[PDB]
Amino acid sequence: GPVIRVAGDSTAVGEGGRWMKEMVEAWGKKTGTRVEYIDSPADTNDRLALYQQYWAARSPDVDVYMIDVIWPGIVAPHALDLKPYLTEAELKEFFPRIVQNNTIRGKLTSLPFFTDAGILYYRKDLLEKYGYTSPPRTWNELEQMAERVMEGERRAGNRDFWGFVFQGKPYEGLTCDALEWIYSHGGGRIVEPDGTISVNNGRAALALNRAHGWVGRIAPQGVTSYAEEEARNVWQQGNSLFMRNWPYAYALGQAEGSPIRGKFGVTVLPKASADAPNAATLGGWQLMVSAYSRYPKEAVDLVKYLASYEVQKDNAVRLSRLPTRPALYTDRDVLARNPWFRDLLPVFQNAVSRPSDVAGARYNQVSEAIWTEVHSVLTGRKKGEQAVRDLEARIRRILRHHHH
Numbered sequence: 106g107p108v109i110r111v112a113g114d115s116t117a118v119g120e121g122g123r124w125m126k127e128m129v130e131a132w133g134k135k136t137g138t139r140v141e142y143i144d145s146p147a148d149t150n151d152r153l154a155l156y157q158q159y160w161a162a163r164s165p166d167v168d169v170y171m172i173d174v175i176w177p178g179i180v181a182p183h184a185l186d187l188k189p190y191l192t193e194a195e196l197k198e199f200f201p202r203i204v205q206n207n208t209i210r211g212k213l214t215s216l217p218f219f220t221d222a223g224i225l226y227y228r229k230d231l232l233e234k235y236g237y238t239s240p241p242r243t244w245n246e247l248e249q250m251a252e253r254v255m256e257g258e259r260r261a262g263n264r265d266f267w268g269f270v271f272q273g274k275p276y277e278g279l280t281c282d283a284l285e286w287i288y289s290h291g292g293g294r295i296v297e298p299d300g301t302i303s304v305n306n307g308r309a310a311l312a313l314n315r316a317h318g319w320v321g322r323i324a325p326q327g328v329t330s331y332a333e334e335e336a337r338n339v340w341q342q343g344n345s346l347f348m349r350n351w352p353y354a355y356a357l358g359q360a361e362g363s364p365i366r367g368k369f370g371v372t373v374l375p376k377a378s379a380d381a382p383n384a385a386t387l388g389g390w391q392l393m394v395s396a397y398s399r400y401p402k403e404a405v406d407l408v409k410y411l412a413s414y415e416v417q418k419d420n421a422v423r424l425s426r427l428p429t430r431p432a433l434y435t436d437r438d439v440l441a442r443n444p445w446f447r448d449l450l451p452v453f454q455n456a457v458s459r460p461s462d463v464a465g466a467r468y469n470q471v472s473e474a475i476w477t478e479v480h481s482v483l484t485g486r487k488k489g490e491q492a493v494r495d496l497e498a499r500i501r502r503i504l505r506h507h508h509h
């Protein structure tokens with residue numbers, strides 16, 4: 106019979122790749138269908154380049170791909186339209202924003218699988234130890250707390266201790282972090298949904314200068330090479346007061362044998378002042394059936410199983426990854442395990458998107474300009490003023506002649 110082959114998630118980031126393979130194997134066993142799991146690299150932009158090799162070849166060697174929220178405009182030609190396979194009632198069980206994101210020129214490219222939003226992780230033991238009663242609401246508070254706790258922990262002998270870790274590597278995760286910095290300073294969305302390239306402004310420049318100010322000070326010098334897992338590792342060993350990261354790190358930090366089990370909370374990221382908007386970059390992954398799959402019916406059946414209530418529930422409970430089904434946010438077992446899903450649902454609802462809708466198939470080019478210019482501020486090569494001017498110019502070139 107058919108072998109249904111899946112590329113999605115990575116064994117190099119948390120438990121995602123291991124769990125994904127488990128769920129695919131479970132479907133294969135339940136249905137009596139042979140399956141195979143193809144592993145991927147950690148970083149989204151590396152995965153995109155890998156999967157583009159299969160798509161360029163029209164390869165039948167992968168039936169189902171797990172695709173990033175930022176990808177539908179890029180990957181649509183390589184997707185089977187899922188619209189004919191779902192009833193309107195079934196499609197409405199997912200958040201409409203994510204279904205809309207995944208729909209390109211009326212083609213439903215992929216089913217929502219898990220969503221994502223950037224959040225602040227904080228050591229509540231350490232805040233209490235240093236006399237703080239709440240996590241920081243502003244970036245200045247974060248920096249003050251980080252300076253004071255670091256001074257204390259270093260003096261007490263922990264030479265590995267930092268105030269803040271985040272994703273500063275030159276890759277897609279930095280565009281995510283940087284959108285949060287920019288938007289939380291009142292600097293806008295880099296490219297607005299209407300197409301206006303708005304990033305050349307003083308608030309965006311301040312946000313990037315502020316981030317430069319952390320590097321080698323409250324954050325390690327090596328932060329400029331950190332992706333999700335590098336940040337998580339410093340944090341999880343107990344060596345950072347704060348971390349910006351996605352929901353998956355919560356369950357990993359609560360696992361038996363984690364040094365920080367029971368010692369942390371999560372909240373919204375800080376912002377520049379009380380009237381700035383809260384920033385949490387929208388992330389998340391979708392399930393696409395390949396336009397090149399020899400087994401579309403079987404592949405659709407697998408994608409509907411993976412996106413189902415019970416599989417998303419297992420992802421929430423075991424991996425602290427955010428459902429794309431509103432009903433799971435009221436599920437007693439989801440909430441008992443992850444009470445912060447209720448607390449931060451409005452943050453997840455108001456998450457700010459990267460400019461993938463407006464850039465469409467040119468999004469990865471836009472993003473590479475963003476992360477490269479941002480990275481030049483983090484390293485002290487450019488000031489934020491120059492970087493936003495240069496970024497404006499690059500994005501204008503990239504998007505010249507691109508409409509809608």
Ligand SMILES: OC[C@H]1O[C@H](O)[C@H](O)[C@@H](O)[C@@H]1O
Pocket residue numbers: 148149173174175220221277278279281333351387388389390
């Ligand atoms: O590193 C950036 C990536 O992080 C997470 O995987 C998010 O879910 C994804 O949307 C984002 O592009």
Ligand SMILES: OCCCCC[C@H](O)CO
Pocket residue numbers: 414415416418436437438
């Ligand atoms: O693993 C599938 C979950 C079904 C649970 C619904 C439950 O009764 C919510 O309390």
